[PDB]
Amino acid sequence: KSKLKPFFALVRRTNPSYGKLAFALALSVVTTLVSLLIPLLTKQLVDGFSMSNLSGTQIGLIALVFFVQAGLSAYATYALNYNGQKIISGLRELLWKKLIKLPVSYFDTNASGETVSRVTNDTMVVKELITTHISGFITGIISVIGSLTILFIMNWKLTLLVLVVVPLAALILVPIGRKMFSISRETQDETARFTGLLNQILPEIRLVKASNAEDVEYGRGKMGISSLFKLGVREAKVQSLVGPLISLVLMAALVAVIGYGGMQVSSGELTAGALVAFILYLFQIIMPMGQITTFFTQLQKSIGATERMIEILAEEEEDTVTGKQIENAHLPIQLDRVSFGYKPDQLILKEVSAVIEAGKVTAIVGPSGGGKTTLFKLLERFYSPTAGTIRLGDEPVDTYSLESWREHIGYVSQESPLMSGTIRENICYGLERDVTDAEIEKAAEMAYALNFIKELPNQFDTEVGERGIMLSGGQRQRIAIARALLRNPSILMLDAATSSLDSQSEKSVQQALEVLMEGRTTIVIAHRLSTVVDADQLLFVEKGEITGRGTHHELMASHGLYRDFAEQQL
Amino acid sequence: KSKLKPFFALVRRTNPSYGKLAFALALSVVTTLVSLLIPLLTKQLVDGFSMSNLSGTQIGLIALVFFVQAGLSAYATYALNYNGQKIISGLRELLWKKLIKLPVSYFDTNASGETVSRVTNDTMVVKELITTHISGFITGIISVIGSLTILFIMNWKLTLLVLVVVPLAALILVPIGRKMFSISRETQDETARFTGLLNQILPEIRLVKASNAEDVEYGRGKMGISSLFKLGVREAKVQSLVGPLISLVLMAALVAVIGYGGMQVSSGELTAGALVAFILYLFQIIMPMGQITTFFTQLQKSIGATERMIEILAEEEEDTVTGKQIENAHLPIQLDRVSFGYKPDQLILKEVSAVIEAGKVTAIVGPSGGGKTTLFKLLERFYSPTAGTIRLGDEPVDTYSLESWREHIGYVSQESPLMSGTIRENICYGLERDVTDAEIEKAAEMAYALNFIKELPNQFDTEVGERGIMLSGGQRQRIAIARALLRNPSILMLDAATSSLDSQSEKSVQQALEVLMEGRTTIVIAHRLSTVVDADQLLFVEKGEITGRGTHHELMASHGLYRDFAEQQL
């Protein structure tokens, strides 16, 4: 198809300073036309010089005019820069919104460091293109058109050769444009890859120091840098080659013009003098043509980078389109025939079916890799079930809206994450309703976290750093549990919520959680049968299917392998 | 102090294209001298009009020389671009080599993502400056000096007036330069912060969806982008202001010159055309001016952008040359009178001291937050103890080189982190010696992970993804255990690693680890006492002080209230 149309559509979507840029373009056009026409009337210049020699109060007029011209040029440049900055800001805003609203599968498949490099660097390159080269192209086009009209006025014939030159120049230029576009895309991709590699390596700085692999990572960084340098060198080579081709085409055009004028001297013989003038005017043609061609090259390079952006700007996203609010929050969750494969081929969950009854703690247990966490991901509708559907009292879950189903659910991850900022911010993360201070204190007390959080500068200091490195594993897990409890949901999912907690801390947190969420549904995933001994409905999962489904004693009698786990613990 | 010195020192620290840079400077100088010949080329061209009608080979040769000049200018531009790209590549390589070597404390305290953004964006800024603006400055300075010579020869008083005007412009530039430097530094810092926030958010998309905080994160991104927009607009305003100030200074210079020449009206100004001639030449002197000053401004920007690198490139890396290589690796580890705190004041470990017997499974056990992990960090020499010393039987650890100490130690982190790439990639890059296929298979089998990897596309088609997300919460732990075991370490410091593992996987991994314990020494941190009941030197770390120090039975019969831990596990 085409690329200019999508690129200009994106720029329009950015909502730029359309009128302001148009006004700046008009200012630049008028000033350039006046400045081009002024030198032509040299007789006016000489008579003005004589008048200034005669007239006394003429310095002020010229000085004011020059100051006004300088101010107009400065304001035009400022307007162009402002418009470019607004365009890049709009691009960044749109890209950030789309990225943050994409489904989890896209991020699972394409990582996140490449996307961030995409946004930042593509926006930067578009900014570089927008500001100066557009002004260069406009001035060049105006100057070329004016000079072409002047040359036509001087002669109606010789301009035919320039009109022949234009297609020749375009034909010479096209391959350069294609090569520049390819190089720009390859660069703006390798830069993203390198940034992603660095980002994933940095915490493996503790990781590497644990090992002895500083040299290997330095070598990987050097290889990425070398690839980027090679791409830059190739782009520079193409940009350099751009010029000499234009010079050669213009020289050939002038040679053809002179050859034809050799015969034209038959009628316009003395017109050779005018011919000389033509040559001079032709040299003027040669200033802005370069400018114009330069713009084209840039107009390709930007496209390259921007191309990737467009791909991100059309995925699809999930929101509360449906609007069907839960409004009940107390129903049994019935899992029908359901099956999941992250790739379309393989299946992790194979024909699962059960009933999480409200008011009881259903515990999913089994060997590692059986498919426990993916069950929670389905239950929170991170992905969409393929085989069947999940209902909440004879109502398909898809009927309800994401913003309502997720609000009524608390979810502690098996890899309990914390984000940079205050502990209070992490506990309160995302909540729209104001928390005051009583709620945070209650949540911390019910998560057995207040004991240490008050041994530090409170619950507004002790920046958790990146990935929660500035806190212990037990503290991190307890902060995650505190966040989940503070959310105050009807459905509470806790997958391996006490993995890294001591026996006493585990007992206290379990007692508090049972007392709180006793009158609400709770789904716990525990590798230790001790915590789930006092369960209500075990859902032993093995290789993506609930082989055993019953209470402690009944499931122990039925399964046979569950006995192996319990007896091994015993 | 000064700024211009450190920046040029940093640039020299790389390996710039000295030959190509000199070649480009020479070509630019010759081009400017051709421009200076152009004034004589006016009479030469009148003669060319007179005689070229009588000569064709002359026009052919002149056109060939023109094309050769065009090619030379193109080559000069290409050489400048190549030199700039090599300079930025050298900066990136040097910065990466430095970063991969700082002590873990700096990365604990300085938001690695901001550092990566620093390197990438500031290298980009230096690349943006170097080529174009050095070329512009060189051409402008040479043209200005050339025109100044002519102005000097034409008249003394007006040239002196122009010189006295020049430092007025120099004085005017100073506040603008300072403002541009401040703006550039602030913009670079804001870009670093924005990239850091974006990279903290995107990888945790799973938590964002669960917390339903899409709007809050979109708002944070919008605020960051608005800060960037404000800085960009302020920079644009400063550049615009740079725009008419030079014009005003030159207008004042012209007025002063006109007045002084009017003083010469009695004598000297008698050559009124010469005065007018001077005015014409005056115009010329400012065409290069618009370049020279510009370069200076850009220089300041660059000096700001790279300011942080100047701080970054001094951090006292400390690897490889405390010249002692461990040669026995079978000595008991004597922990002396050690007290460590991440902050200078607060103490995590308080007067800890003990002995780890070479060949005994010392188990550090205690409530969360006691300081178990920090002891392991001290053992790996991530941080140096601030109280005493660690000796392997009457030999301080500081004597041995870091490389030797860390090549003999297997360390499984609490996080159990994984990097992107194939499963085999982690256990390959961990070491430097070749590992075969058989050794990798044995290591995997020694961690009860071979079956699951065999189910997948056989250890090379599987990609763990960023942060090890494609794998489960137990499979990644088993992979970390396999990496630890593959190194064949003398000391196996196994921080809690059977957390997410199941009972049967725990049993298998424990049997393999017991075989290795029969091999050599081992240190394990266990949250559950059931897994270390058969240990030898059970330690109890509470609040940084080891209260109980003895075997399991004697520790239980001797220690006080914390015997409830065992009873609680009962």
Ligand SMILES: Nc1ncnc2c1ncn2[C@@H]1O[C@H](COP(=O)(O)OP(=O)(O)OP(=O)(O)O)[C@@H](O)[C@H]1O
């Ligand atoms: N993108 C993915 N995210 C999660 N699991 C994935 C992905 N791609 C493939 N898988 C497969 O899904 C399983 C991991 O999720 P699963 O539900 O089995 O884990 P789990 O029960 O929480 O594990 P464990 O008990 O070991 O912590 C593995 O079989 C893995 O190969």
Ligand SMILES: Nc1ncnc2c1ncn2[C@@H]1O[C@H](COP(=O)(O)OP(=O)(O)OP(=O)(O)O)[C@@H](O)[C@H]1O
């Ligand atoms: N940068 C830091 N890294 C680690 N711990 C830190 C840091 N700064 C302060 N600390 C303190 O150190 C302790 C966390 O490390 P510690 O050695 O106590 O954990 P741990 O024994 O591994 O914990 P757990 O049993 O929960 O896994 C906390 O008391 C915390 O406040």
Ligand SMILES: [Mg+2]
């Ligand atoms: Mg710990």
Ligand SMILES: [Mg+2]
């Ligand atoms: Mg799991």
